[PDB]
Ligand binder design. Sequence first.
Ligand SMILES: COC(=O)c1cccc(NS(C)(=O)=O)c1
Ligand SMILES: COC(=O)c1cccc(NS(C)(=O)=O)c1
Lengths: 265, 264
Amino acid sequence: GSLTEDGLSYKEKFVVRSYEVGSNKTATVETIANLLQEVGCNHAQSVGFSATTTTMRKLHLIWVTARMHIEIYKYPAWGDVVEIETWCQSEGRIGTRRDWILKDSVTGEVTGRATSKWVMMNQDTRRLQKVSDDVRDEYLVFCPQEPRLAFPEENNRSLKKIPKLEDPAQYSMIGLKPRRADLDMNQHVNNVTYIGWVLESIPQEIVDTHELQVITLDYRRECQQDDVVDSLTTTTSNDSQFLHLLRLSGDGQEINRGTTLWRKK
Amino acid sequence: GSLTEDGLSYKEKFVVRSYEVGSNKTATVETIANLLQEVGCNHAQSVGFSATTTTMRKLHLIWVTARMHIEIYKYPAWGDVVEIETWCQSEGRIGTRRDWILKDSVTGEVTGRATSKWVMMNQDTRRLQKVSDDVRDEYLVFCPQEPRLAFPEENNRSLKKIPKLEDPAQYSMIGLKPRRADLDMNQHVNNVTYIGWVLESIPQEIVDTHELQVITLDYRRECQQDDVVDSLTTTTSDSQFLHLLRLSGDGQEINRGTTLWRKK
Ligand SMILES: COC(=O)c1cccc(NS(C)(=O)=O)c1
Ligand SMILES: COC(=O)c1cccc(NS(C)(=O)=O)c1
C-alpha cells in the first residue's frame, strides 16, 4: 500500500484468501466491501489521520456512512491479486465522498468499482450536521481539485432514489444479531455486516444461479450490539432485481434500505 | 508464503487489518484462527493438494477437525506483521496433526502457538475412518520424520480431557445462526465460527478486563447452515471457563471446550 505520485490517491494489492471465497471459489461481496474499508483506512493513515481531522476530534464529530454503491464485473478468484485504488473528494457542505476502482493485478483490467457518501455526525448526540469551513480546508489538501468520479455517467445507478419495501415482503430472514466479530475497534457494528444481512433474505436458489452485479445501500440508523434485525426482500423485476429493507425486530425501526441487481451465471 | 529450506514446513507473513482488531486495537482470536487456516491451505497448495490425497479423492474421504488448541502471549496490533510457521505430522492410524508457531516479524519473538488434531471421515456419510497405509505414504514425504511439537511438554494443556457442562449454565447465548459469510467454499460452516460462538456466552465484563490466553476446543458434530446453536458457559476457577455448544432444539452436542483468561 502506498499513495500515488501526486499524493491525491492511494493504491494497495490484496491476495485473495481461502476463507474469503464463496461456493464459486471467487471472493464474496463482503470480502470486497471489507477490502475497500481496509484501503480507505490505510489511505487515511498515510496522510496523518486516526478519518477524523484536528477540528473533528476537538468538536466530537465523526464521519458516518450515508450511502454505499458497489458494482462488480468479475469477482477475484482464490489466490488472485486484486489492486484497489481509492481517493476522497469534498461535496461542499453536504459531506464527503470516497471512490474505489478494483483491478486485476495481472491484466490491469477493471474488475469492479465503488462509491460511498459520508455525513458529518456528533459522536455523542448522534445529530447529523453540515460540513463547516474549518473542516473542509483540512481535507482539501488530500483530495483532487478537479472532480474524479468512479461512476461519472449522467444517469449512473449510484444516485438513484430507493423506495420503502411494502409489507408483506416476498422473502425474509428474522432474528439476525451481531457477534463480537461483527464489531469494529470502537464497538459499533461494522458497515459490512449490514450488507451480509441484506443478502440473507435472498433465496439460496438466486445465489446458486446468479451473481451479484450491483448493490446500493442507504444507511438510516445505527444497529447496537444488543439489537435484533430483520432482513426483508421483494423482487422488483436475464437480470433479476430486488428491493431490500433492514429493520429492528421489535418496533420495526428502519436501519437500512437498498437494491440489488443479479445476472444469470 | 513459501516452504522452508527442507520443504517440511511452511512460513507466511500477514499484515494485521483494521477490521481484524477488537476494542483493544489488537487482533482477535478468530482473526488468528482464520490466519492459521489460511497458512494451512497455502501449505497444502504448495505441496500439490487440491489436504486430500489422490487415494482420498477416489475413496470420498476428507479430513475434519477433531480438536483445536491455541495459546496466545501477545495479540498482534493493527498494522503489525505476524509470521506464522506451520507443519503437518502423522499420528499413526489415529489421524494427522497440524502445528503452528506465531512470531512477531520485527523482534522474531514467539507471540503464540497452536496445535490441532484431524480425523479421517467419509464425506457422503459421517463415519470416522482409522486412516489406511496407502494414505500414510502419500503425506509422510511432506512431514518431518522426527517429532516436531508446538506443545512438547509432558502432560500439557493440549491433550487434556474436557467434561460436559451441567445444567444450569452460569451464562448463555441462545439463537446463534450462521450467515453466508460463516460458510466455506463447500457450504459447510467454517470451524472459526464455532470459536466465535463459544466466546459469545462469555460476559462483556470478562472481555473488557481480561485477555484470552488459552482456548481448547473439541468438535463432536457439524453444524448445518439451517441449524440454530446455543452457547453455554460456567466459570470453573486467572479466570477459567467450561463451554458447550448445542443445537437449540434437541440439544445435540456440537462442541465442548475450555478457556483461560488473564487480567489485562
Ligand atoms: C444520512 O445518514 C444517516 O441518516 C445515518 C444515521 C445513522 C447512522 C448512519 N450510518 S451507519 C454506517 O452508522 O449505519 C447514517
Ligand atoms: C472426532 O471428530 C468428530 O467426531 C467430528 C464429527 C463431525 C465434525 C467434526 N468436526 S467439524 C470441524 O467438521 O465440525 C468432528
